[PDB]
């Protein structure tokens, strides 16, 4: 869900508060987006937006209110590693990764703080 | 999901293997049921069958393949206590309890082993 995504950003980046740092950053990090990601760390976010985009299409899945952010799926973090349980059904397994790939991706991309709280519908 | 239900039966009854002991027991414990529960520990199972029965009706919920046993929902067991996270969405929150009430209920009901592997479609 939302709280696990964050909790996976800590797992991978034990140097944060993934609420402060990556929520409202550049064009796609945070809810929504438009324009071209302004960075690689924006790209991570853009791509994860598609990860969820795509999920909504699996006709096998029917996520609540229609925001996969609402899907609880059990994973476990250990030694800065992000594993994804397999007892996990297919819809939550899709999210697990949508969420796990960002956490990975993020830990490996330059954080320009000059893109945190960007003028969204302006420089987008 | 299935693996958490079990994992909650340990939480509440640290004296088991909730696979062996309560799967295939009396008429409702296990998959399906017919007849009147043969016991109180059968009643726990019957009632949980309705708990899931009911869940399928919440038009807000749409469970995979249509067996709420397939719903992962995060809970945490501590000091023989079964808590149910609230970061949990409403459909998985319904299951959490359907599952938590059995675990409670079970720990408090006489286990006749003379009902384990009962002639289902015979004494039902
Ligand atoms: Ca986004
Ligand atoms: Ca779930
Ligand atoms: Ca049953």
Swiss-Prot record, chains A, B:
Molecular function (Gene Ontology), one example: phospholipase A2 activity
Cofactor note as given: Binds 1 Ca(2+) ion per subunit.
Subcellular location: Secreted
Post-translational modification: Acylation causes dimerization.
Keywords: Autocatalytic cleavage, Calcium, Disulfide bond, Hydrolase, Lipid metabolism, Lipoprotein, Metal-binding, Palmitate, Phospholipid metabolism, Pyrrolidone carboxylic acid, Secreted, Signal, Zymogen
Active site: 48, 99
Catalytic activity field: a 1,2-diacyl-sn-glycero-3-phosphocholine + H2O = a 1-acyl-sn-glycero-3-phosphocholine + a fatty acid + H(+); 1,2-ditetradecanoyl-sn-glycero-3-phosphocholine + H2O = 2-tetradecanoyl-sn-glycero-3-phosphocholine + tetradecanoate + H(+); 1,2-dihexadecanoyl-sn-glycero-3-phosphocholine + H2O = 1-hexadecanoyl-sn-glycero-3-phosphocholine + hexadecanoate + H(+); 1-hexadecanoyl-2-(9Z-octadecenoyl)-sn-glycero-3-phosphocholine + H2O = 1-hexadecanoyl-sn-glycero-3-phosphocholine + (9Z)-octadecenoate + H(+)
Entry EC no(s): 3.1.1.4
GO biological process: cellular response to insulin stimulus; fatty acid biosynthetic process; intracellular signal transduction; leukotriene biosynthetic process; lipid catabolic process; neutrophil chemotaxis; neutrophil mediated immunity; phosphatidylcholine metabolic process
Named cofactor requirement(s): Ca(2+)
Residue spans crossing the bilayer: none
Disulfide bridge map: 11-77, 27-124, 29-45, 44-105, 51-98, 61-91, 84-96
Lipid moiety-binding region (N6-palmitoyl lysine): 56
Mechanisms controlling activity: Regulated by bile acid salts. Up-regulated by cholate and down-regulated by taurochenodeoxycholate.
Binding site for Ca(2+): 28, 30, 32, 49
A single Gene Ontology CC term: extracellular region
Family assignment from sequence similarity: Belongs to the phospholipase A2 family.
Subunit structure of this chain's protein: Monomer or homodimer.
Miscellaneous comment text of the record: Loss of activity upon alkylation of His-48 with p-bromo phenacyl bromide; Ca(2+) and Ba(2+) protect against inactivation.
Function: Secretory calcium-dependent phospholipase A2 that primarily targets dietary phospholipids in the intestinal tract. Hydrolyzes the ester bond of the fatty acyl group attached at sn-2 position of phospholipids (phospholipase A2 activity) with preference for phosphatidylethanolamines and phosphatidylglycerols over phosphatidylcholines. May play a role in the biosynthesis of N-acyl ethanolamines that regulate energy metabolism and inflammation in the intestinal tract.
Name recorded for this polypeptide: Phospholipase A2, major isoenzyme
Organism: Sus scrofa (Pig)
Shown segment, full-protein numbering: 23 to 146 of 146
